[PDB]
Write a protein that binds this ligand. Structure first.
Ligand SMILES: OC[C@H]1O[C@H](O)[C@H](O)[C@@H](O)[C@H]1O
Ligand SMILES: [Cl-]
Ligand SMILES: [Cl-]
Ligand SMILES: [Cl-]
Ligand SMILES: [Cl-]
Ligand SMILES: [Cl-]
Ligand SMILES: [Cl-]
Length: 190
C-alpha cells in the first residue's frame, strides 16, 4: 500500500569495543559505527520523511567528546545514558544514512537525526524517496571505578526513531524503529 512502510531496527555491537587498557566521566572507547539504509521501507508511494530519535535510558549527566569516527571537527556535549551496569554508561550520536550528513550528538530529550535542518525548521524533511535510514555511533563511558577483567553488558534498547512525513496518512501511523545496543563482553585491563 501507498503508506505501507514498516520499521526495522538499527543495531550497534558491544563486541566491537577494544580492550580498555587503563578520572570520571571519561570515554573508554568507541564501538564500530553501524548503518541501516532501510530503517523504514516498503510503502509503494515515495514520501518526504524525517526521523526523530528519543533516547529511553536513564540520563546520568553530560560529557564533552569528539567521535574519532564521523567528521565533526569540534567536540560536543553528549548525554551519558546508563547501561545498567555500575560504572558504565554510553553516549550516542546518529546521522543521516549518507556520509555527508553530520553526526548529531544526542544531548536533548529528542532530536531529529536527519535532516538536521528539522531541529530548527519544523517543515523540513528529506527529499522524496522510498526509504529512511541512518548511521549509529556509540562510545562507552566510565562513570566510576571499573574492576579488572571481563564485564557482561546486557542488550539494551537505546531509544526509538519516530518516522514523520508531510503526508498526513503516513505521519499519523507513528511508525517507530528501535535503536539497539547488542550486548556482549568487554574487558578492562588495569
Ligand atoms: O536510497 C536513497 C535513500 O537512502 C536512505 O534510505 C536515505 O535515508 C534516504 O533519504 C534516501 O537517500
Ligand atoms: Cl542495523
Ligand atoms: Cl559491527
Ligand atoms: Cl543497509
Ligand atoms: Cl562528534
Ligand atoms: Cl533496555
Ligand atoms: Cl497528505
Amino acid at each position: 500500500g501507498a503508506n505501507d512502510y514498516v520499521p526495522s531496527p538499527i543495531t550497534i555491537n558491544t563486541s566491537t569495543l577494544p580492550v580498555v587498557v587503563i578520572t570520571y566521566p571519561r570515554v573508554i572507547g568507541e564501538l564500530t559505527g553501524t548503518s541501516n539504509q532501510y530503517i523504514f521501507n516498503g510503502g509503494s508511494l515515495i514520501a518526504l520523511m524525517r526521523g526523530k530519535f528519543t533516547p529511553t535510558l536513564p540520563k546520568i549527566g553530560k560529557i564533552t567528546y569528539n567521535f574519532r569516527q564521523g567528521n565533526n571537527t569540534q567536540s560536543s556535549d553528549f548525554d551519558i545514558f546508563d547501561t545498567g551496569v555500575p560504572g558504565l554508561g554510553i553516549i550516542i550520536g546518529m546521522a543521516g544514512y549518507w556520509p555527508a550528513t553530520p553526526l548529531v550528538p544526542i544531548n536533548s530529550s529528542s532530536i531529529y537525526i536527519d535532516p538536521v535542518a528539522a531541529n530548527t525548521n519544523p517543515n523540513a524533511y528529506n527529499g522524496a524517496t522510498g526509504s529512511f535510514g541512518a548511521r549509529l555511533y556509540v562510545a562507552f563511558v566510565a562513570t566510576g571505578r571499573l574492576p579488572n577483567g571481563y564485564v557482561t553488558i546486557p542488550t539494551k534498547q537505546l531509544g526509538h526513531i519516530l518516522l514523520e512525513s508531510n503526508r498526513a496518512s503516513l505521519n499519523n501511523k507513528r511508525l517507530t524503529a528501535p535503536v539497539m545496543l547488542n550486548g556482549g563482553r568487554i574487558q578492562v585491563q588495569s
